Symmetry: D2
Subunit: 238 residues, 4 copies
């Protein structure tokens, strides 16, 4: 009812595995037509296969969120074949933090500004930003993780204010320690130490991030905007 996304087109970047894949499946399951992206032709073909195997109408595409040209072209392709995406989920050393965060926010900003025209026309939108998963070792890692998270929060809160009068919401999801291919390959010691800091005593599932995204994308979340919802089993960092 509120939870139906029937008749909506959703763009989910970095959808070939993990949290991205799970998000694309959840939006599909809720009735959306889903366009998942990857950076390689191989990843984009994998996305198309996964969507087919789950009954989800849509497609898999190649997108480089760092490139104005790729963005504009990808959106054009979506417009030609399926219509305007009105749900967009952005998923995709210690001197590094400043350049990393800056690059992420430019990518969000590029993609968000591009998809906004269609949302502005429609007078309806959902932009949802996925923060980074926990598990990078040492002080350099924690520095990079906290910087990214602070930049994402403020970015999300600001963009929400800019576009709010158009009935477009902008929210973010801050994952904690989630069971993914990248975290499975973490050394066992780092993992056990992470696990011990989580009140729920387990890793989160990728589906458990996707469910939050699915809700935020629904009509029932229409008065939620500028928010960063943490999904972390009770483990909070400053």
């Amino acid at each position: 009812q509120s939870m139906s996304l029937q008749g909506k087109v959703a763009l989910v970047t970095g959808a070939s595995r993990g949290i991205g894949q799970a998000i694309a499946l959840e939006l599909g399951r809720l009735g959306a037509v889903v366009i998942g992206t990857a950076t390689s032709a191989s990843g984009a073909e994998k996305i198309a296969e996964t969507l087919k195997a789950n009954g989800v109408e849509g497609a898999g595409l190649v997108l480089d969120v760092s490139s104005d040209e790729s963005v504009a072209a990808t959106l054009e392709h979506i417009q030609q074949h399926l219509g305007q995406p009105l749900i967009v989920v952005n998923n995709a050393k210690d001197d590094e933090w400043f350049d990393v965060v800056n690059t992420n926010l430019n990518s969000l900003y590029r993609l968000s500004k591009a998809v906004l025209r269609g949302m502005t026309k429609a007078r309806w939108g959902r932009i949802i930003n996925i923060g980074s998963v926990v598990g990078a070792m040492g002080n350099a890692g924690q520095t990079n993780y906290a910087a990214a998270k602070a930049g994402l929060e403020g970015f999300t809160r600001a963009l929400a204010r800019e576009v709010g009068s158009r009935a477009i919401t902008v929210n973010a999801v801050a994952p904690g320690f989630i069971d993914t291919d990248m975290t499975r390959e973490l050394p066992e010691a780092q993992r056990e130490a992470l696990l011990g800091q989580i009140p729920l005593g387990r890793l989160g599932q990728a589906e458990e991030i996707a469910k939050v995204v699915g809700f935020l994308a629904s009509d029932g979340a229409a008065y939620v905007t500028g928010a960063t919802v943490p999904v972390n089993g009770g483990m909070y960092m400053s």
Copy 2:
């Protein structure tokens, strides 16, 4: 009858359920299949709750509960246990006044939460959800009261979530902004227009729109969300 991904057969306790946000929450949990026990402080309010639930096809009851009283809490829970089973979803709903107000709210949450925890601990499953106050008065006293309550609620929610997390019980809160309620309808027209201008969405929130967030947090999909305060405020953030 055996449920899957639904609130069916779960018993939910929603306090202050006679009107506004509380009522809407009770209806949403009912709609999602829960057996719902709504509470009020008066016999009259509790009867109103029972009627409203009946009129909407929701199985459950309306009861009298004084969350300031250890006796009333224990007695109310016993009655629920006898008739319907242990409530595994619990929604707590309800410038020099701020200290007493916040203090009283948190003692009431703590009392009720501690009481319902034994049943959740046995079941190895639970959902406690705390509703913050609505943005309800325009002056300085109001904004002070609202920010104090909200800060106390956030930290309380985060702490309890840590205490009970290992038992697969989640504890979250919902921080409403400016919601269309009897309290806010009676605000002067001049204050309303000035309110709306501080809200990016340009409108009041509906009580249903708080209830939908609560319904989601109560679901299985929200199992990895705990200690969180979800703001539902149309983009107006105020501390």
Copy 3:
């Protein structure tokens, strides 16, 4: 023939609770060093006598008294005594928090004590149209889960409390601020095994424990006239380790 100090708090009376050791003692010495007349408190006669001796040994004019911040009577009586003998305390540092399902009762008890003491001292500050109330948060003392829960709860309650009281009293030129210590060096943490120490320090960008004096300096500043537009703030003093 009377000696007039040129220090920032000359001619002010300061009340510092829980002043018998650690951060409290250091705060009392700093305010004294900055020229304040200083009344340090403890819960026992022996602690109050220790305070008086320490103050005397450091050239600080003032006293050591017994105060139980959990008791309305003790608070009122202690204030009256201070008024009679030395004058109204217009700088008040609340240090004396407790410790030891426990988090809720601890935090609640602290905030009632702050509120009691703050309300009592406010009459003198309201008359004077000037005040400084400064609340000291708890030291990082437990690295598990129960400890981190207690520490974050206390800190959140203190922050909102501080911010709210600041609003209530602001129009009277009284400021209300808090100081949130991180890992501060004490006799108990020096005796931690060398292995646990190195692992702790690796969480702190500065790579060292804070000194009690380093909390006291921040308190001394917030107490000054230059800090008059700082109110409702919680200043973290933690060497860059932020945890919540």
Copy 4:
């Protein structure tokens, strides 16, 4: 005492910047204040002279790698390394915030070599004074996280990095504000008044002192009790 220390304060020709330069001077620092025009830099030199403060006034464009490097070199030749650096000079929310942080990062990275050598430093970032609310909150969030991160990167070198978040301060921008906006602002400030530029400077002076050595990664709000989310 900041006796024997060299301080670089950008945007020092008026307001908060000027007051910061005078406070650091008063505390004994040799002070280099910057402005974007020759005229502003000359004004700074005059103001410093008139107050007994040793130092200089220079032209600096924090958006330019060349100007930064050259300015530092000039300071090094004549006075020695600045070990206290106050970034005051800042300037569609997205482009503004991004530009500020690049400037902070540029200037901070440049001054860090001298601080790393000395094994001592103080970097202090001044936030913006109170569409507008969006810009202000974005800037403040970016500043906080920036300040907290840089503090972690440089902490082991006994360099602290902190920020000051002003509220409604009596300055050129705010003097021109309409009476209606002012009165509405005052009513949201518990202290019931504007802050003085000196009152920001005093916080900066303290953060620059040895007694603030265990404070790092902090943003100290100086706003009379008015807080915005």
